[PDB]
Amino acid sequence: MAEVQLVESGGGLVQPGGSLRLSCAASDYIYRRYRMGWYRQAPGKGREFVAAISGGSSINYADSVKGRFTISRDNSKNTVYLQMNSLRAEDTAVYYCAAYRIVSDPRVYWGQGTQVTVSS
Structure with a gap:
């Protein structure tokens, strides 16, 4: 069998421009x-x-974050990173990691989310 686990961190409260x-x-499977x-x-x-x-x-980036957010990964840690710059109040949301492989797996796997709040 294979283990599936997705663990998010890094959320928090910052000010506009933060x-x-x-x-x-x-x-590993994922x-x-x-x-x-x-x-x-x-x-x-x-x-x-x-x-x-x-x-x-x-x-691939959504239009609303192009140029401000950057995605990357570290194979030695099995981790994907989202560098979030120039934050706006409208970026406030729960941010979720998802994993999907539509050619071979009918399931989309979701983490439980991390809260991002941008408030002055």
Whole structure:
């Protein structure tokens, strides 16, 4: 059998113009072959794409974060990072890591989310 685990950290409270760095640590099964993405959801709104990496396609960013957020990964730690710069109040949301491999797995795996609050 294989273990599936996604662990997010790095959320917190900052002011407009501030910055954060989120991390998503994945089990080996997931990290070696799945596309890994960040999504976010504010209360009352739908969940939306932020950025993604790996899984056989190139890095992709949502329009609303291009140039301000940067996704990367460290194979020695099985971890994906989201460097978040120039934060705006409208970036306030729960940020979720997700893993998906649509050619071979009918399941999307989600972390439980980390809260990002941008408030003056």
